[PDB]
Ligand binder design. Structure first.
Ligand SMILES: CCc1cc(C(=O)O)c2c(c1)C(=O)C=C2
Length: 503
């Protein structure tokens, strides 16, 4: 069962239930299938064929998810163009991907119009809410692609065929099978609670971005509705969440930090205690989970994955339950190897059951040996129960007397202190020790804090060789965090510090 046919099967058996909703709109499973079918007929009527590449360039709307499924239905390769791309970058991807069609919305098209229309390989350009004076040459209004009824023509889709190209300047090629296996990984990470009185799934990452594509396919295949928000909706996220009350929210760590910060004001208070929230990336969200529980009483989850691995590969279904920084457990079929360093800690290597096909180089696919391991650049230790303790980036590792020291582990200890609001640990060169550990300490509250408190606190909680040699008290840590750039600004930091304490 490929991704479209899995959607279809569910839509035909659960026709009346809401598949997608926004603040002002909704569409049932059955009507979304009808829209997908009309788009498929319009594409084929416009001479789009299995294997043709379609660049897709639009904000969150029902047409975006319908277009993904229409491409899948007919075997057209979809090429999502991130909304963060400049006009020159969008043109580069349209050209590099060898797209022969483009589908976009009004805002994205008109920001990029001259570039898109100068891509001479584009035989069809469809634009939602195209201005009528611009319907000419190969540029068409979106309504044209759905104007004809479904023609019931067959499609022969095979799981080894290309389905999509997800650009990181590297076009990662997914087959129909990659997408099946990536959605199957993602399905394991979407676990709303049982309602008390139907779950709606929200992803705060744009639907043009691969993690949200997978979340959306997986949610619909589990029969959940998907809530789509606009940029303005997400700028007003606290009020939007009170109104829409999703059961499950995916987002970046930054998304959830902002949600936390909005509560410091407000009044009516947003109740996320029953909501399952999933922070997504290539790091660890343990400190965020502590803040998120304090603020909402909700138990943050995390997902760790990347496009080259097809989908999510490691999932932490309860970050806050683990006192150490951790990233969770490998998903089903995921294989891991921890590089042997003659110790329990090493680089995390991953092989995923969602095998990408290769890299599109503009002219051909550079094929991936299906046995390849991906080196993540992250250090881990695997506990007895499988949980991957997170030791930080390999390149942030500090050496003390020959032994590796991990800033993220020291930071996690420091912030548990009631008087410490935040902390960043890094090293500086030292003529005779090689490196020396510095701790940037941001005092909590409106409170006072003496370094001697910290050194004694660390004696009880950390091995001595992991201890900072020096404390820099500053009541705002520079963010925008790069322990490398902070090391480079060590003398500046000391000169701006509330106080410095050298042991
Ligand atoms: C589709 C591959 C993938 C991409 C990304 C991303 O941050 O872009 C993420 C994950 C998977 C994930 O499990 C959490 C973040």
């Amino acid at each position: 069962m490929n991704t479209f046919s899995s959607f279809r099967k569910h839509a035909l058996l659960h026709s009346k239930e809401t598949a997608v909703k926004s603040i002002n709109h909704n569409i049932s499973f059955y009507n979304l299938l009808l829209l997908i079918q009309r788009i498929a007929t319009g594409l084929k009527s416009a001479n789009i064929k299995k294997g043709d590449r379609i660049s897709i360039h639009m904000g969150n709307c029902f047409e975006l998810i319908a277009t993904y499924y229409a491409c899948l239905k007919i075997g057209a390769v979809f090429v999502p163009l991130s909304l963060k791309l400049s006009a020159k970058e969008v043109k580069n991807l349209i050209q590099h991907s060898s797209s022969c069609a483009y589908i976009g919305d009004k805002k994205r098209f008109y920001e990029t119009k001259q570039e898109i229309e100068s891509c001479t390989m584009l035989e069809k350009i469809w634009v939602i809410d195209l201005k009528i004076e611009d319907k000419e040459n190969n540029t068409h209004n979106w309504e044209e692609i759905i104007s004809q009824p479904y023609d019931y023509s067959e499609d022969n889709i095979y799981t080894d065929e290309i389905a999509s190209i997800f650009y990181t300047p590297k076009g990662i090629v997914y087959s129909q099978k990659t997408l099946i296996d990536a959605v199957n990984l993602t399905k394991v990470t979407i676990n709303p609670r049982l309602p008390k009185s139907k779950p709606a799934i929200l992803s705060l990452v744009d639907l043009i971005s691969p993690w949200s594509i997978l979340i959306t396919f997986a949610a619909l295949q589990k029969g959940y509705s998907v809530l789509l928000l606009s940029e303005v909706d997400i700028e007003n996220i606290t009020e939007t969440l009170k109104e829409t009350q999703p059961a499950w929210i995916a987002g970046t760590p930054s998304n959830f930090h902002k949600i936390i910060k909005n509560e410091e004001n407000n009044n009516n208070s947003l109740d996320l205690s029953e909501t399952v929230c999933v922070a997504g990336g290539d790091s660890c969200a343990t400190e965020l989970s502590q803040k998120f529980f304090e603020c909402f009483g909700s138990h943050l989850q995390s997902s760790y994955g990347q496009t080259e691995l097809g989908g999510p590969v490691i999932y932490h279904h309860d970050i806050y339950a683990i006192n150490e920084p951790s990233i969770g457990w490998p998903l089903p079929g995921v294989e891991i190897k921890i590089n042997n360093t003659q110790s329990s800690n090493g680089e995390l290597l991953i092989r995923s059951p969602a095998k990408t096909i290769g890299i599109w180089n503009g002219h051909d696919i550079e094929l991936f040996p299906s046995d390849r391991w991906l080196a993540t650049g992250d250090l881990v230790r695997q506990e007895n129960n499988g949980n991957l303790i997170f030791l930080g980036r390999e390149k942030d590792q500090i050496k003390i007397e020959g032994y590796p020291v991990y800033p993220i582990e020291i930071e996690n200890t420091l912030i548990q202190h009631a008087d410490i609001a935040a902390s960043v640990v890094f090293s500086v060169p030292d003529k005779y020790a090689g490196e020396r550990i510095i701790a940037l300490i941001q005092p909590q509250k409106n409170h006072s804090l003496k370094a001697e408190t910290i050194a004694s606190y660390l004696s009880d909680n950390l091995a001595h060789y992991k201890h900072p040699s020096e404390y820099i008290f500053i009541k705002e840590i520079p963010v925008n965090i790069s322990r490398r750039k902070l090391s480079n600004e060590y003398h500046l930091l000391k000169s701006q510090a509330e106080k410095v304490f050298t042991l």
